[PDB]
Symmetry: D2
Subunit: 357 residues, 4 copies
């Protein structure tokens, strides 16, 4: 027949991201998921910060945001339990008390600095009212190279899926999968390990069966897309919701129910080569988040990747309260931070004890 | 069985763009493709303008860009042959000699003003070296609403596909289809008729058979994606390349060969409900572009949509030359513009005569 | 880069059915869709025949089936209005009154003989209760070559889609599209023009809007699949339902409503290169079927392919009744057949007159 | 908005095979993959049997086929190392020496009886010359229910992918994935655990890198399809090739290279919930097949499912030779069978020792 010489990269099986950061990516990821450690998510937007401060009456300025972050980041000792921090863009450039930038300070202290690189939720337009896509791919490589150069070595991008009426449009499932897979690839290209966050939200009256049905489908499509875009599985992480009943469903699950539904869902879709899952805690209480993670790490189902946390409110809530926005609340604020971080560090080892909370 | 009440928009067959500009979109499009008329593409970037001016020694300033556009846009009389102009963002805000903005002036004169809304080509990263995606979806609705408000009623977004080694990666085929279909939807949502331009480039040594094989595949995937995103076919247009031998292939086709390969390719993939195809002229001479369009409009194959032009260099080249960047070349510059615009207007009627060029 | 020489057929854009019957396929199809002609579907299974005979008390034997077919097929003169007959496998081998096989007799008389080659409906298993796939791909090439050798030059394969609750599973949409596209390809390979029948059934209480929403989606997916399998559009035909309200919806549409919804649906999805659509009449009365086709051929929307009929009950019903299963009803049976065939022949020209029925 | 009540099975995330054999499937599979055990594939067709007998001069009759099977199946003691036997259809109905059917005899002896249910390879028609699809879906449920009723509790279906020129068409990749996923679903529905065999063949001059690139792509598409059809991962098994250099490449890999490429490939695509992989040995020597499996079970990469064998020639070759087609070779034939089965049983434990072969 008529044969032609072509590049192998023009062939379907050869669409694979080739990145010279490869080995570095793989090493960051193992660092991120070290045993007894997890990630502190501290990438609240300026607005989310208003919310955060609201109950303590703290005014919403750059300086105060800095302080709210320093509260945790300069909590010496937290490094034993937190392996990386997802910063907000503003924090990357702020200075730690030593005068190093935050990324510089954390690296020195042994904590990998990451950055939230998505540009926020927007209406999906296709599919059903209430569904949302996420923006931020334009100019992405240039931002990401700039964060790398600032010292970040991982990034995070969140897509959400709102269950309504027991289901989600296939439009959001596909489109958001496609966005996450693109983001992953480009992150790896620029040297940052991508945290792929496909959050099936806890919002609504749905139950845990509905949650599992939608998550399993959403997440397999995210996987199919990562394959289709060529991701380095060994240099990537997942940040999924746990499978639980909906926030307004009226029902609460035990942690052992949670860990089984979650882990059996994940084991159906996530390749064992992905090094770790850093669960989001969205809507759960600080205690539940620890109890639920702990059960995961005690679940008899297959779970070949590390199962750890990537939490924001569930690690900060009480701290924020005790801190009060004042220098004077600083110590108590930390004590509380440390305790929650320790709880969760044990829960990753599967040794947390509720009597201890 | 277990039944549940859901929104119809959560169902697969209901992912259809619902836009209150619908009827307006449909009417613009028919206006754009009126018999004996075509579109002037005048959306060169600032840089492309350097190129354009290079041979006449015209310096590259905003003022001179304005003049280069006014050369054509204020060429009274051109309105008989041009139904719409694809402006560059800068031109939207510049003023015509009457002091109306350009969009305002053209509308008054009967010419629909459109706007190039993509953000330019960038490396695809996936697929093979040399392939390119197009940026610009972020912030798109807000830009588009702003152009609408300025009077534009259509927009244009170009994706390209570089044939190398006889083929193109399936990665570029899919990804660029996906980008075009998203852009289409959002354009319609904001009131602008989208020109979907999936250009299989003339660049390379490939021949016309290779061109047809790749275009047919690229374009069916663009269609499948438009269906999958929910486009209003009746409010959309296509701006494809013609199917011709590659620029460095060494071969030149007759116009009748061209029109048959082109039209038989399109008739295999484009739904008859899409109102019109406004061919790009990329790489063809000014004469060829007219001869080739003319043959299309004389082709016995099925061609239910309007077949017209959407040309830039092939309508401006000579004009630019005769104009010379000087007030003094103005009249000759126009004469030439008018003549090429008239040639092409006849070629859309299938009555162009080469003896006349 | 690393380049490799491969077959062009290993590349995505080169998966195109290459069939030496190509030109013959194209010619059959134009024959099938000649102006003022349509297809008689006479491919009832043995069982369907029980039904057919039930009201006339005709016993269900091979001999009687033969006679029931001969009633129409040896109705000299019907050749003016019918261009091809879809036979059942049994009929292919039966003999006409001249002693030629039926295929031989029809060809001699100017009627292209086709054959129903699917193996019947079966439970889809995936998707929702009530949905159905169609069997018959195994051993297909050998059957098809055998029909060709017997003189058939086209074939027919029917898939169905049952609307329930306003919708259909995406599973049936995809799977049945995939089956139709495979069948098409293989038919063409063996020399038979494939009639692709994706019937959205009239069954249920749905309305005409629901019908249009599901048909448009079902049919675009059938098209995407035909492209994906490589079909010769110019050597293929479509046999879709008309878009009408559901049989138990309680509403009846005018013919002009029907033709607009139908033709605007088709014009959104079917490539203009497919030579013709031979509508099925499933559930409509004999009169409605003619009135509805007539309106199609009077519809101002785009409709580049031939729009004709491929009917069974709506051409046989009355005939069967008048014939009565007796030699003695033969003449009246034919008269009635002829009249319905003439009605429909005019309706294809867009000149049918109801005053005439 | 307009809401409608639909079946949940009409929604995308609900296309999941619901089978009342579920728990039984899961239990068979764990039985099949018990530690230190593997499957004997004895499903050679009548023709393959000619080949098999050729070198020993054994005539090719049903009786002799029976004897060739009895050689292994009535090799008392083999039950310690073999957990299930893939029979050929003919063997299902033949009788063991006790007068039980083979399935009955094996079950009694503790060996799960399975059945090869595909109908053989055929030309793909689409894609490139040399590629092949597999037939057998028509009438599948009725066959499968009949095997179940005969006592089989698992089945096997093989698809192949021929690397040529370094690659494979995307057509074969997709189509064969689609066939395997359909087969899986239907098998589970009828009570038989499906062995999904997507064999990337060892045939050709390709190297091990090419093998890994194609297998990874072929196998992820098989997975995506299994998800898309709704398979019960926990009740399914995989029978893939190992990743090795091509048979005519001129290079031989060490077993440790093999196990790393294989396991790292699988860990990128196969969900950890699939209970086990039963490798095929196609083209490898009897020794290599054991050494290669052993290394797998010694590989430090992630490998959450059982890694065992499903071998035919590599367990029978020598035996067949020693047996000689004669009663008289019977004992030596068994000795050899036992030894190879023991080798492989140890290799599944990762304790095989080559000094022992």
């Amino acid at each position: 027949s008529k044969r032609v010489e072509v590049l192998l990269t023009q062939l379907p099986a050869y669409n694979r991201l080739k990145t010279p950061y490869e080995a570095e990516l793989i090493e960051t990821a193992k660092k991120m998921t070290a045993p007894g450690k997890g990630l502190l998510a501290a990438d609240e937007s300026t607005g989310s910060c208003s919310k955060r401060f609201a109950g303590i009456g703290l005014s919403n300025t750059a300086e105060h945001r800095r302080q709210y972050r320093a509260l945790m980041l300069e909590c010496e000792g937290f490094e034993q339990y937190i392996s990386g921090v997802i910063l907000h863009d503003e924090t990357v450039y702020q200075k730690a008390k030593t005068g190093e930038t935050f990324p510089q300070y954390l690296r020195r202290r042994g904590v990998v600095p990451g950055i939230k690189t998505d540009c926020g939720l927007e209406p999906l337009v296709e599919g059903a009212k209430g569904e949302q896509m996420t923006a931020g791919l334009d100019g992405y490589i240039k931002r990401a190279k700039k964060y790398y150069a600032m010292g970040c070595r991982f990034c995070k991008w969140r897509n959400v899926y709102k269950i309504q009426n027991g289901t989600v449009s296939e439009a959001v499932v596909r489109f958001n999968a496609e966005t996450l897979a693109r983001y992953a690839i480009l992150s790896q290209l620029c040297g940052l390990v991508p945290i792929v966050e496909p959050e099936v939200m806890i919002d609504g009256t749905h139950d845990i069966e509905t949650c599992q049905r939608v998550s399993q489908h959403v997440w397999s499509e995210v996987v199919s897309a990562l394959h289709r875009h060529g991701v380095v599985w060994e240099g990537c992480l997942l940040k999924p919701n746990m499978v639980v009943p909906g926030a307004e469903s009226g029902l609460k699950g035990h942690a052992e129910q949670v860990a089984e539904y979650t882990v059996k869902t994940l084991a159906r879709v996530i390749p064992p080569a992905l090094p770790g899952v850093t669960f989001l805690s969205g809507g759960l209480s600080e205690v539940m988040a620890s109890e639920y993670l702990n059960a995961m790490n005690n679940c008899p189902l297959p779970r070949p990747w590390k199962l750890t946390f990537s939490y924001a409110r569930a690690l900060q809530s009480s701290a924020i309260k005790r801190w009060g926005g004042k220098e004077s609340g600083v110590e108590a604020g930390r004590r509380a931070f440390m305790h929650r971080a320790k709880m969760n560090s044990l829960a990753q080892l599967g040794k947390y004890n509720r009597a201890d909370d």
